[PDB]
């Protein structure tokens, strides 16, 4: 095995110093090509605002000290060296959530006889991804992985996007690579765009380590079928039950119970929706807006059912049916709303007259009570016609505005480039 | 001057800690184990893990670390850090996490004849498959399996410690350092050397030392906080048979609410038992039973309401039904005259209809009483039976049913 002799010559006889940049003159710059391969988008915890990714970092650079003549040795055209024996660039994830900056596994580098070193370690990265909850669950998120070289300044090593050849001309790899042989498609998040940019900040200096970085962006769209089936449909049905609660007769004794139960169910749904989102004040979630609107509407329904019940249970003994309310709720509105439609003889005479008078007063009282009942029916019919259209229109508007929300079809609004793998620039 | 310095320099000089200290080719190192339990920290039901604070005592003989005490001013015991010495890789194999080895690598007590005495502390989390059949009246049989991770039975001979010739076949418990769990009582604590006969003296898994912990749960907390409230609330169903069968009686309200309370209790139990599917916990069986009984009582309330609130308009009271349920189980003058006649007739008809309604109400009441007696019997028998079979789950008298030995010091 001449690999042993070659490695001994390269590292021992040549006195390779792992802590010196691979340059021949101190003022030279080491070019580091960098690309990212996404093998699995493990999760996106909206509560923690964290993106967990299974990625392969691809570093490539030139080390003139690791060159050899493939003929002087046997025809050795490649060599695997551990990363703790050779100089490597310390490219770190700056926007990580936990304290994990580097790659998970420090695998061997691949060195070619011309000094071209490559390093393709795997990593589990937990980046910081602010969550835009404005259109939840019809939302798309814009996560980024920003990689910086904090060990050397921009005057000493230059980051770059890795290039690729198609017809002899080099083109940079301006996207996250998705290898079909090693990519698992997430069941909840669909990758729309995945550009990669090499940012420079001119307000800083090449003196230091904050002048450059390579950022890999990930515009992912949520698949909303799960939330539509499990959170929105039951909520909508239970909400419509409230509008239905207007059709219960006041004698049923369950108008208030029905409306209250609908409100409580909506509150439970609101709390469970709160459980699933970050506690940020940027905007109220779309479903949160819908739930607040529907809870307010159902509270109005409860109040109006209370008004209907109060009107229904009035009597002449405590209220007077005025002419205005009578002509409003028994003449105009019912038509507007198309609603349907020897002393013993003397004592006996006196007693029967008293009985007749009492029955007449009782019948008049019952007539007044019936008029009050008709007023209550008119009021709740009007309430139904006024509220149910508001409920259905609000529901449709809120859930059509959410459905009419797509990623912008191009990352970097000002950039006309597509940043797609199929059309390198 | 500390002669231990030059003694240890001599001993560890020209000493390879990677080499098993076998004097000859066929020499088998005897490694002696002894577990001292200081605290049973917890038995996490959800993850089925027993956490213990133990001192594991490991003893072997390393002939390389032997000296003549006369040459070192009578030094016959030195402490050498365990990182510098050959150790038998004795590990806890049935660990829930990846922690095979001890937590703190203490020093090794090395005696002049080569005897090595290692007593490191350890927090061990070991798998305990939990049997929920009699929760919360259950006793668990947790095990700690120790074996060498590196050397097979041809190299290292695991054994239990023996003092005064008698082997210590139990988890030792030092009175100077031991704390009662407060939820678990240690009933038996045997230890035995086991063999995997499917393997041979190679493969490193042939031999092992198993320390057992048959622990019994104290159920007073669970009784008072879960079972008594559950039984008390479940007993409320039988009250629905004394409420009136009309609007405002609220039979269905009470029944449905008791059912909902039982559901809440089911959720409560779900937070206390493991999520395994081998058996249903006894308390879970009781909860399912009472929920089913409350569903039956809801049905019976609906049926009694339907029977009681019947009218001649909708339903006809059959003579057979009435017998069964009430015999075994329990110019101007003429116009004025016509007006009076009709008034009397209408009053009589209304009164007759009222009487029929009253008969229906009586039938409902009789059904209600009979079904009350049935429901009370059913609920009482179910509760008594389930919690009596719970109360009769004794810990076995012997640690191993086959053996007649008690495995106690």
């Amino acid at each position: 095995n001449e690999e042993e002799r070659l490695i001994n010559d390269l590292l021992i006889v040549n006195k390779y110093n792992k802590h010196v940049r691979p340059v021949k003159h101190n003022n030279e710059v080491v070019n580091i090509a960098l690309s990212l391969t996404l093998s699995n988008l493990i999760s996106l915890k909206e509560t923690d605002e964290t993106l967990t990714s299974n990625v392969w970092m691809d570093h490539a650079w030139y080390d003139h000290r690791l060159t050899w003549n493939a003929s002087e040795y046997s025809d050795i055209s490649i060599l695997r060296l551990p990363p703790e024996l050779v100089w490597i660039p310390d490219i770190v994830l700056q926007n990580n959530n936990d304290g994990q900056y580097h790659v998970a596994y420090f695998c061997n580098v691949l060195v070619r006889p011309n000094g071209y070193v490559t390093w393709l370690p795997p990593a589990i990265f937990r980046s910081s991804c602010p969550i835009n909850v404005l259109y939840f669950p019809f939302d798309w998120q814009n996560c980024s992985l920003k990689f910086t070289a904090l060990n050397y300044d921009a005057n000493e090593i230059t980051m770059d996007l890795m290039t690729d050849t198609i017809d002899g001309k080099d083109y940079p790899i301006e996207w996250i690579i998705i290898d079909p042989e090693a990519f698992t498609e997430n069941g909840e998040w669909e990758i729309i765009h995945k550009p990669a940019k090499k940012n420079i900040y001119p307000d800083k200096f090449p003196n230091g380590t904050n002048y450059q970085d390579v950022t890999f962006y990930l515009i992912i769209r949520r698949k909303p079928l799960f939330y539509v089936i499990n959170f929105i449909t039951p909520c909508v049905l239970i909400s419509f039950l409230a509008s239905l609660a207007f059709y219960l007769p006041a004698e049923s004794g369950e108008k208030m119970s029905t409306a209250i139960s609908v409100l409580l169910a909506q509150a439970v749904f609101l709390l469970l929706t709160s459980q699933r989102l970050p506690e940020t004040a940027l905007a109220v979630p779309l479903i949160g807006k819908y739930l607040m609107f529907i809870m307010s509407l159902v509270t109005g329904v409860i109040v109006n059912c209370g008004i209907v019940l109060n009107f229904h249970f009035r009597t002449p003994s405590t209220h007077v049916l005025s002419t205005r309310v009578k002509q409003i709720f028994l003449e105009k509105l019912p038509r507007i709303l198309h609603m349907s439609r020897h002393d013993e003889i003397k004592s006996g005479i006196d007693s029967t007259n008293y009985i007749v008078k009492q029955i007449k007063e009782k019948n008049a009282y019952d007539e007044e009570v019936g008029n009050w009942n008709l007023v209550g029916q008119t009021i709740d019919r009007l309430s139904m016609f006024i509220i149910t259209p508001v409920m259905v229109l609000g529901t449709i508007f809120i859930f059509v505005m959410g459905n009419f929300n797509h990623p912008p079809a191009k990352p970097f609004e000002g950039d006309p480039f597509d940043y797609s793998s199929d059309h390198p620039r | 001057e500390n002669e231990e310095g030059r003694l240890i320099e001599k001993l560890l000089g020209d000493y390879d800690k990677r080499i098993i200290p076998a004097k000859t080719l066929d020499h088998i190192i005897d490694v002696t184990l002894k577990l001292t339990l200081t605290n049973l920290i917890s038995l996490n039901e959800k993850e089925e893990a027993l956490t213990t604070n133990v001192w594991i005592e490991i003893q072997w003989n390393d002939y390389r670390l032997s000296w003549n005490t006369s040459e070192y001013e009578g030094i016959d015991l030195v402490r050498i850090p365990s990182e510098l010495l050959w150790l038998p890789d004795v590990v806890l194999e049935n660990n829930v996490d990846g922690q095979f080895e001890v937590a703190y690598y203490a020093n090794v007590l090395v005696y002049n004849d080569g005897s090595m005495y290692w007593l490191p502390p350890a927090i061990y989390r070991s798998t305990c498959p939990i049997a929920v059949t009699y929760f919360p009246f259950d006793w668990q049989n947790c095990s700690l399996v120790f074996r060498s991770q590196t050397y097979n039975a041809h190299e290292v001979n695991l054994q239990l410690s023996a003092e005064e010739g008698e082997a210590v076949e139990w988890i030792h418990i030092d009175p100077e350092d031991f704390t009662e769990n407060g939820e678990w009582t240690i009933r038996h604590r045997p230890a035995k050397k086991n063999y995997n006969w499917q393997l041979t003296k190679d493969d490193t898994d042939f031999q092992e030392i198993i320390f057992f912990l048959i622990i019994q749960r104290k159920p007073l907390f669970y009784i008072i906080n879960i079972i008594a409230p559950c039984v008390l609330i479940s007993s409320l169903v039988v009250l629905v048979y004394f409420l009136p069968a009309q609007a405002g009686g609220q039979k269905c309200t009470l029944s449905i609410s008791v059912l909902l309370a039982q559901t809440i209790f089911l959720f409560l139990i779900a937070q206390k038992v493991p999520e395994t599917s081998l058996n249903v916990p006894l308390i879970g069986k009781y909860l399912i039973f009472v929920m089913f009984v409350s569903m039956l009582i809801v049905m019976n309330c609906v049926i009694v309401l339907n029977v009681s609130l019947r009218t001649p308009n909708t339903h006809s009271l059959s003579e057979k039904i009435k017998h069964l349920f009430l015999g075994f189980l329990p110019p101007e003058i003429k116009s004025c005259v016509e007006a009076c006649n009709f008034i009397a007739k209408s009053t009589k008809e209304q009164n007759d209809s009222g009487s029929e309604n009253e008969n229906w109400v009586l039938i409902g009441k009789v059904i209600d009483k009979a079904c009350f007696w049935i429901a009370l019997l059913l609920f009482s028998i179910g509760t008594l039976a389930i919690f009596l079979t719970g109360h009769f789950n004794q810990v076995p008298e012997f640690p191993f049913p086959g053996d007649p030995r008690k495995y106690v010091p």
Binding site: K15, N17, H19, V20, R21, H25, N26, N27, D90, V92, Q94, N95, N96, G99, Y101, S128, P130, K146, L150, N151, Y152, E156, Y201, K204, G253, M256, S257, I260, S261, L263, A267, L270, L271, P278, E279, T280, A281, L282, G288, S296, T299, I302, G306, I307, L309, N310, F313, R314, S317, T318, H319, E344, S347, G348, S351, T352, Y354, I355, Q358 | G248
Partner: protein, 406 residues
């Protein structure tokens, strides 16, 4: 390069990184400490810790790391692994976990004059005492105490870090617009830095960085306060329902249980310290007690409504108050056969008259119930509105001071 290797060999021929650089016995090493904030990640209120992603800008002078650039092909500064040079054990003293030291050990920059600069990154979890009084309309005062764990004032002199043009000290946390993510739940109001001593300990000195942050309460508003306002509206309503509806207890009890559930589920997010009751919990308790009193008064009104002569006799004071005085103020103003047939008619008439009198007394009781209910409606509306407005006005007037006092 070869020359860099030669320089490294010369510099570290006899360099001991265990030894603090004091060219003469008694010299003190001046260490400039500055903090750069890249992300305020979490302010966990339950465990009372703040998680931050920071750079720790350290600077000091090591006389042993000096060389002439002209003698080494003009090399003016080197990047060296941090473990090869002495550095002050600058740590976060008030960490919540056991992590005192940095996470990322970047290379130190050594200039030919001996000046050493080090900017290691770290994810620090620092303990923050949370003032729960105005939660969620609260501003927190979280600090990060940095000092050398090993060396005291007799050995190292902590100073403030200099700005880019090293002419003036930066007595504040530095935030880089290019690399900084806003929390979205907290806004940074002040970020001063200050050196602190101890009068009872002359060997103690640290550089403390303060983060005066203000919470954005939109989440808590939307998800806790407005629903409770709706519940309080229902509680007020319960006094408009007629007693005959048979739904007064349903409504009041539903409101009570709803507010209780809201309190139970809010108990997760508030801290568990007992130094004060947060304004949100105080509002929830106020609403819960108000709804409980609504339940009690609804029970009283129901009891009054269902009385009759057969069971109760109306006392003088009830009639005086609820029939006469209050209603004006509440605007709630309201041949043997013939002889025996005659006897039967007499009996029927007497029954009707007695029933009328009985029903009149019952109507008086029901009117008393109605008037009391209207009074309760007005009183509870006033109390609920005033209390809610007062509580939230007190919350709204809670802002961090203009002067950070540090």
């Amino acid at each position: 390069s070869v020359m860099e290797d030669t320089l490294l060999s010369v510099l570290f021929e006899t360099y001991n990184p265990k030894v603090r650089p004091a060219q003469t016995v008694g010299d003190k090493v001046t260490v400039r400490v500055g903090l750069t904030l890249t992300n305020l990640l979490i302010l966990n209120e339950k465990i009372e810790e703040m998680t931050t992603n920071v750079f720790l800008n350290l600077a000091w002078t090591d006389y042993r790391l000096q060389w002439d650039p002209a003698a080494y092909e003009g090399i003016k500064d080197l990047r060296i692994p941090s473990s090869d040079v002495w550095q002050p054990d600058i740590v976060l003293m008030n960490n919540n976990d056991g992590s005192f030291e940095i996470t990322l050990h970047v290379n130190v920059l050594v200039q030919h004059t001996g000046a050493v600069s080090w900017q290691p990154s770290a994810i620090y979890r620092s303990s923050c005492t949370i003032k729960v009084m105005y939660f969620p309309f609260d501003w927190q005062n979280c600090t990060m105490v940095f000092k050398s764990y090993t060396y005291d004032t007799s050995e190292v002199t902590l100073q403030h870090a200099l700005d880019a043009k090293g002419e003036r000290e930066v007595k504040e946390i530095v935030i880089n617009k290019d690399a900084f993510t806003e929390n979205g739940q907290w806004s940074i109001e002040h970020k001063p830095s200050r050196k602190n001593w101890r009068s009872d300990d002359p060997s103690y000195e640290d550089v403390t960085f303060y983060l005066i942050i203000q919470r954005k309460p939109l989440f808590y508003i939307v998800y806790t306060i407005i629903p409770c306002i709706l519940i309080s509206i229902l509680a007020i309503l319960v006094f408009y329902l007629p007693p005959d509806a048979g739904e007064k207890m349903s409504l009041s009890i539903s409101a009570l249980l709803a507010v209780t559930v809201f309190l139970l589920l809010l108990a997760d997010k508030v801290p568990e310290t007992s130094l004060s009751v947060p304004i949100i919990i105080r509002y929830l308790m106020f609403i819960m007690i108000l709804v409980a009193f609504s339940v009690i008064l609804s029970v009283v009104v129901l009891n009054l409504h269902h009385r009759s002569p057969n069971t109760h006799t109306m006392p003088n004071w009830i009639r005086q108050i609820f029939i006469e005085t209050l209603p004006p103020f509440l605007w709630i103003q309201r041949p043997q056969d013939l002889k025996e047939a005659v006897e039967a008619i007499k009996y029927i008439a007497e029954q009707l008259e007695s029933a009328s009198e009985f029903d009149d007394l019952k109507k008086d009781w029901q009117y008393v119930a109605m008037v009391a209910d209207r009074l309760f409606l007005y009183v509870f509306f006033v109390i609920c509105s005033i209390g809610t407005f007062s509580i939230f006005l007190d919350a709204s007037h809670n802002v961090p001071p203009d002067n950070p006092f540090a």
